[model samples]
Target: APVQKQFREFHDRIKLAQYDENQTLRDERDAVLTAVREGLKKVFADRGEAAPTFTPFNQGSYAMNTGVKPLEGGEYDIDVGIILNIAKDDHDPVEVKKWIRDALKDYGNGAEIRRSCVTVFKPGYHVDLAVYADPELSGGTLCIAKGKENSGDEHRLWQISDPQGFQDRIASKLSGDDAAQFRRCIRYLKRWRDFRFSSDGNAAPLGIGLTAAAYWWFQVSKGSGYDDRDALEQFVQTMLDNFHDGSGPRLTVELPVQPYNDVFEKMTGMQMESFKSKLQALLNALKTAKSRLELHDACKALADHFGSEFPVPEK
Candidate 1:
C-alpha cells in the first residue's frame, strides 16, 4: 500500500506538469512560428526577390512531443527549421543567415545570430530558427553564417544535421504502451536533469542526450512494472543502472538516425565528470532506498533530484 501511494503521488506530480499540446506553451510556440514566417516574408520582399520557397517545421522535443512544462528552466526553447528550397549555390551562407537576423532585428529584444541559427526571444520561450539549404548541399545540411561564433573566428560551414532523422527514430523506436512509457520516463528524467543543473551548479547532459539514451534503456512490460505501484521507481532504477554499466572513459550519445553524429562530443571532460557524479549520487540514494522501510525515504530523495515539480508526499 505504501508503494502504491508513493507511485500514485509521483504520477500525479508528473501529470500536473507535463506539456499539453493545446496548452499555452503550444499556442505560444505556434504564434512565434507565425511571427517568424511573416518576418521572413518581409525580408524577401525587401530584397526585391520573389518570395523564395521555404518550409518551417518544428524540431527537438516539441516535435517529438516530449516537452515538459518549464517548472524550473523558466524559459524554454523551441527549435524551428526554415528549410530553404533554393539551390545551394544560389545564395551564400553568410547572406542567408544575415537575412534571417536582419529580418528579426525588428523583434530586437533578444534576437541574435548564433552559429547555425538565428535566436529570437519571446516572453517565456525563444525560437531557434535554424537555416538549411536545399538537397544539393549534401542532404540538406544546415549553414552557419560567418562571424556568428565566438566573436568572429571567420569561417562559414555547413554542419551535417538530421533533426528529422532523429525525430523519426524516436517515433519508430517505440510505439503502443512502450512509447507511452518511454515518453513519461523521459519527462521525469528531464525534470531531474533540469533540477540538478539549475540547483547544483554542475552541468547536466542535454535533454536530447537523456531522451535518446533512455529510448535505448527503457523497458516496458507488465512484470517490468509499467502499470504497477513500482512503475516510476523501476523505470528510474533501470535507466540509472544501465547508464552506470555503459559509462567509461568519455560519455558519448550518438544520433542513431542519419547524419549520424555524436551528440555529446562538445561536452568537456569536466562537464561529463560532473554529470556522472550527480547521477551516481542519485543512483546511490536509490540503492540505499532499497533498504529503507518507509517509501517516504525514496520519495524524499526523488524530490531532491527532481525539484519542486515532484512534491514529497506527506509522511
Candidate 2:
C-alpha cells in the first residue's frame, strides 16, 4: 500500500509537471543546457567564431532522465552535453562543467552546480546536473556518475543496480521471461512495426539510459567479437536471439531471471505466429518494456499460456 501510494504521488507530481516521456527531464535538463548554450553563444559572439549550426542529437547531447528517485535529497540527475564540431581538446571537461555551472547558478531559478554534477534545490525537490563534450559524429552521451562524487564509473545510459537504477538512467530494467515473451504478440505496424519505438511503462526516454546495460548483458550471455564489445551490437544480438526461435525448448539455466514464463503463456494465449517477422521490431518493444514496469505487465499479460510453454531457467 505504502509503495503504491508513493508511486501514485510521484506519478501525480511528475505528470502535473508535464514531464515528457520522450524528453525525460525536459525542463530540469534544459535549464543547465540552456545556460551552456548561452555561454557558448557569448564566447563565439565575442571572438567572431562561426557558429557551427547544431541540433540536439536524439542519441546524444542533452539527454535527460526524469522520474528518477533522488539519490540523497529528492534530487535527480539529468545529463547535458555540448557538441564541438571541431576535435580540439581545448577546454577540460572539469572547466567546461564550471562555466556551465556558474551560468546556471547565476540564472538562479533554484539551481546549483557541483563537480560530477549540479543541482537545482527547489523547496520540495532537487535536480542533479552534469555537463559534457561531444566532438564530431552525431554526438556522445554525457556519461553517468554514482554517489556523491559520481566517481564509480562513467556511463551514457543509467546503471542497472535494480529498478531504481533503471529509472535513474531512464531505461526499463524489468526482468524474467514474461518480458521476453510479450515481445511476441505484435509486429507489422503501418506496414513496418510499432513496438520498436514504443516506450516501456510508457517511458521511452529512460530506455536510452538502458542501452549500455542491454549491451553488457548481451556480452554475459554470449562472448564478444575479435576485440571490444563492438558498439552495442552485443545486446542487439542477445535481443534478436531471444525469440529468434519460437518458445524455445524449455531449457533451464543456472539462475532464474523471472518467476516463470510458462505461467504467463498459459495466462495469455501465445501462438506460434509470435515469431513471424524480423525479430528486430519486437526486440525494440521488449527493450522499452524492460525499462518500464507497466509495459512489462502488458508483456506478461498473457499468463494464460504460462505453465503450458516455458519453465524457469534451470539451476
Candidate 3:
C-alpha cells in the first residue's frame, strides 16, 4: 500500500511537471487566439460580406486540462477550435482553408495548414486551430475543414468530425475523485506516448486514442481503488490484454461520443504489437514491485518508457 502511495506521489509530480504551467506560454496563447479571431473577422469583412459567425473553444489535452510537459526543451501545443457558423455548401473546403492561411500569413511564425487545423508556430508553444462547420450545417453533424495533399497537389475537404462531442464524452466519464485521477492517468499515459512516439509518427495511436482507451479501461475496471498506481496499472493491463489477446481481431478505441469513430483505425498491425509489447514489459516490472527498492528500480524502468522527468525514489 505504501508503494501505491509512492506511485501516487510520483504521478502527482509527473502531472505537475507535464501540464500547462508556464504563464508566459499561456499568455502567448491568449494573444494568438485574439489575433486569429480578429484576423478572420477582417478577412471576411474586407470581402464586403458579413463574417461567417464563429466562436473559439478549446480542445485536445490542453482543453481537457490533461496536457503534460513535452520532452526536455520541446515546444508546447495549445489545441483549440474555431466553430464556424456557416453552411457546409457555402464554401469550398479548399478555399476556406486557403482563406485561413491567407488571413494568418502575417502570423509571423510560419503558420501552415495541417490535416485538421492551421498550426501556428509561436514562441514556446504551437497552436492547432481546428475549424469545424456548425453541426446544423450537416443535419446535426459537424463538418471539419481539413487539409490534404495528393501527388504533389495540396487541397482541403470537409470531413465528418466531432471534437466537441469527444470532449463532452470524455468529461462525462469523470465526476468526483475519478475525475482527477482519470486525468492524471491520461497525463501519465500521454507522457509515455510522447516518449515513445513523440514525433508526428503516423504509425502510433494519437493522444485522443490513448485517452479514450484509458478511460474505457478505467470505466471497465470500475475504478483503480481510487489510487493512481492501481488505476494506472489497470489501464496498462487492460490495454495490453485487449490488444494482445487477439479476441476481437483488432484493437479498437472508439470515441465515447456522437459519431463514435474509431480513433485507432490508422494503427497498423506492427504498431499494435509494439504498443502491447511495451506496456507488457512495464507491467512485468510493476507486478514484481512491492518495496521502495523494487519501486525505485521499477521507476527507473518506467523512466525508459517515459522521459527523465518521470521521477524515481532517490534511494
Candidate 4:
C-alpha cells in the first residue's frame, strides 16, 4: 500500500543514520570521545597514578541502531560505556564515577556525576559515559559503577550489568532485511514517544524500554516483502496485549540480560497507564492510516502521532 511507502519515507527522516550523516554532529561526537580520553589521562596524571587502560564501547540506541533524531530544540543524547581496568572490590563505585567526572571536568560544558554515568554536556548534544569495572577482574561479568556525586555509601556500589550483551541479544533477534525492518519500526516507535511525551523527568518511557519491547514482541511481516505499517501495527497491538491485567494496565519489559529488571519498573502506575493509553492512541492512528485509501490521508493520520517528520505525500 501507499502507506508502506510513506512509512519508509518517515523512517528515513527519523533514523539516527540520517542525523549522524550531518558532518557537524559527527565531528562533535568524535571530539567528545577524544576529550574523554585526553581528560582521563590528565586526571590520573594529576593524582600521580598510572592511568589505567580502558576500553570504550558504544551503548544504548547508538549501539543497537534504533536511535531516532531528537525533536527540534532537543539535545542529541549519546551513551558510551567505559570499562576501566580496575577491580570493583578495590574502589568505591562513586569514587570511580568521580574519576570520570574529574577527567571530563574541563571538557565540553563540564561533567556531572549522575547515578549511573558521568555526563559531559556539549552544544546541542551530550554524552553519557557509563563507567564499568574490568570484566576480567569482576569474575567475567560487567559491573557498573552506580551512584551520584553526593550519594550515601548505601547507594554507592557496583551493580552487575550487561549492556553489550543486551545489544547482542537485540541484534540476534533478526538479520538481513528483517533486521533493517526491525530497526525502522523501533525508530518509528521512538519518534512517536518523542512526539507524544514531554522529555522532562520520567514522563516518557526510556528509549531502551521501547527497544526491549520491540525485541520481544516485534514480528516481521511475512510475505514476499516487508510492510513497516503492518509490522508496527502488529507490534503495537502485542505490546498493548501484554500491558493489561486484572487491575487496569501495567507494562513490564525486562532487560533480557544480567541484573534483569523491568524496564518500566521506574515508571509509576499513573505513568504506565499514560504510556498504555498513548500506545493505544498510536495503534488507533495506525489503524486509521491503514484504513485510508488515499496516500495523503494515510500519511496525515500517521503524522498526527509521529510528528511532522512523517511526510504527507500528495495524492
Candidate 5:
C-alpha cells in the first residue's frame, strides 16, 4: 500500500517526487545519453522528420532468469527502442523490421547490424535500438523499449496494443509485485508535468518517444557539455521540479504544462522551446489519466515470463 499512498501524493497534491536512490549515477550517465540521443536524431533527421528524443530505456545490465547474462566481460549492450502507435494486429514484426532496416541504412556504418534491430556505438555503451510501430496510433506516437522481459534476456519492443490486456498481464498473480513496481516508475515518469502524451499506441505520447525526446530536450536545455548520467539526472530532476512545480510543497504540483512543445510536424527538427511546451502538455495528460490506468503502465507482452516464476507472494 505504500506505492498506492505514494501515488496519491500525486493524486492528492499534484506534485511529482521520486525516491532518490542513485542520484549521482543516473544523473551522470543520462546526461551523456542526451548527446547520444541527439546523434541518433542526426541520423534520423534525413528522413526529414525530427527524430524522437533520446530516452532512458534499458541502459543498465542485469541477469534475468531468462537464462541469459552479460558475457564474461560483463560488458553491457544497451537496448534502446523507439515507441510508435502501431497495431500489433496490423503489420507483422518481420515485415516491419525490414522497413526499419532500410530507413536505418541512411544512418550508415555508425550503426551496426544486429539480430533484431540496429546498433549505434558510443564511448562505453552501444545503443541497441529497435522500433515497435503501434497501428493503434496509425503510426502516431512512439515508445522506446528499455526494461527487460520476464526471461531476463530480451527487452520489450513495444507496449501491448490493448490496455486491458496490459493490465491483466501486470496484475497477474505471478509477477504482480514486479509488475506493480514497474508500473509505479512508469506512472511516475508519465505523470511529470513537463511531458507531452498521446493515446496512439506508438504515439503513446508517453513512452519511448517521450523518453528519447526528453533526453534530447534536456541536453539542449542546459550547459554545453554533459556526460551520459548527467543527462539522465537532468531528466529526473527536470521531472521532479516540473512535476512538483519547482517546489515540493506538494507532489504533482504542475498539471499539463501550458504552451508545451507539440512536435506535430516531425518534418521539422525539435526546437528547445517547442520541446518544453510539448513535454509540459504530456505531463498533464499523464496526471489526468492517472486513475484510469492499471498496474503495469509500462509492462506488456512478457506476462508469460512474469508468470514463469512461482514466487506467489502471500497476500
Candidate 6:
C-alpha cells in the first residue's frame, strides 16, 4: 500500500516555498538584482559608454519550480539569467562577465566572477547571474557567456543555450494535478540525494539531471488520490532500467534544449557506479517501505534514505 499521507507530510517539510518559508530569500534576491541593474548603469556612465539594456529572468530549479529546501541549512542557490542587448560576436564572454562583476564590486561583500556567471552573496541565499547575448542577432539562438576571470581566448566564448526553452519544455510535459505531482517527486528525490550523498564535488547527481530524468521517466500515480510512493518507485525503476551498458554503467540525461549535453558528463565511472548502487539501495528501501503494514515502519524505511525530515506516524 502507498503511504500517500506520510509522503505528503514529508513533501511539506522538504519542498522549497518561494513565497512562503523562503519569501524573505526571494525578496533578498530581488533586492540584489535591482542593485546589479543600477550598478551596471553607473559602470557604463563612469566609462562614458552606452549601457546595454538587459533582461534578467529566473533560471535553474527555481525557474522550473522543483526546488527543495537545503538539507544542511545552507544558503539557497538562486540562478538568474541576464540577456544583454549585444551581439555575441562583438564582445568576449569574460568581458561581459567582468562588466557584471564590476557592477557589483561595491555591493555587499562584493561579487565574484565565476566560469559561467557572477555570484552575489546574501545572508540566507546566493544569486548566480548567468549572462547571455541577444538571440535576434544570432539567428534566433541564445548564446551564454562562459569562462573564468582569467582564461585563454579559446576557453572564453559564447555557447548556445536556451534556459527559457528548457523550462517551457518541462512545463509542457504535464499539467494540473499531474504537473503538481511531478514537481513533488522531483523534490523528494532531491531531498533523498541530499541525505544520501556526500557534499563532495560531483559525488551527488545534479538536481537538474534528476529533474530531466523525471521529465523523461516519471509516470503519474493512477487512482483517486496521488500516490507519491508509487510514482517515485516507478520513476527510480525506470531510471535504473535506462542506464546504458558500456565500460561500466552510465546514466546519460541530455539537456532537452540547445547544446544538448549529457547532464552526467561530470561524474566519473566510479561516481556513476556509486550513483547506481545507491539508487539500487533506494529501490530496496522503497520496497521495504511498501511491505510494511504500519505507517511508522514504512516511514522509517523511507527516512533511512530521505533523512529525519520524513515524518513517521505515531504508533
lDDT of 4 by residue, 1-315 (tens): 347777887887887763234465456656767887788789889888887667877788866778777888887778888899998999989988887788777896699998888888876778888999998897887899998877788988899998988989988999999999999988898899889998887879988898889988999995756788889899999998897563557888888887888888877788888998898889998898878888788888889999998988876
| Count of steric clashes across candidates, in order | 0, 33, 2, 0, 74, 0
Cα lDDT listed for each candidate: 0.64, 0.33, 0.69, 0.83, 0.36, 0.86
**Best-matching candidate per lDDT:** 6
Candidate 1, residues 1-315, lDDT tens digits: the string is 234345445545654222345476567656666666677789878878766556777777777877766664466767778877666567666667776776667774847877667888877778887888776653455542333634533466555667787888787888887787677667777767766775333366777777777666666635434542244456556545543233454556666764556656656567777776776776665555455676667567666776765545566
Candidate 6 lDDT tens digits, 1-315 = 468888888888887865334676577767877887888899999999887778878788877888888866666688889899888988988999888888888888989988778999877678889999988965687999998877898888899998888889888899998999999999999998888888688988988799889878999996879888888889999999989989999999998887898988989999999999999989988888889888788888888989998887778
- Better-scoring candidate (lDDT), 1 or 4: 4
Q: How do the residues 1-315 of candidate 5 rate in per-residue lDDT, one tens digit apiece?
A: 012332333332321222134353345345434554555566567667655432233322211111112222322344444443445446544444443444445443455444445565544345555555544454553432323223233443433322223223323423543433333333334433122333223232323333323423343212332122233335545654642222212212111122123322231222334345544544443333233334343111111112211011222
Which sections of candidate 3 miss by over 4 Å? 16-26, 41-53, 136-139, 149-156, 219-226, 244-250, 291-295
Top-down TM-score ranking: 6, 4, 3, 1, 2, 5
For residue 161, give model 3's deviation from the true position in Å: 3.0
> Which model is ahead, 1 or 3, in terms of lDDT?
3
Q: Candidate 1 local accuracy as lDDT?
A: 0.64
Report RMSD for candidate 4. 2.3
List ranges where model 4 is wrong by over 4 Å.
18-27, 245-248
Error of 1 at 95 (Å): 3.0
TM-score for each predicted model, relative to the true structure = 0.81, 0.34, 0.83, 0.92, 0.28, 0.93
TM-score of 5: 0.28
- Model 1, residue 56: distance off in Å is 1.4
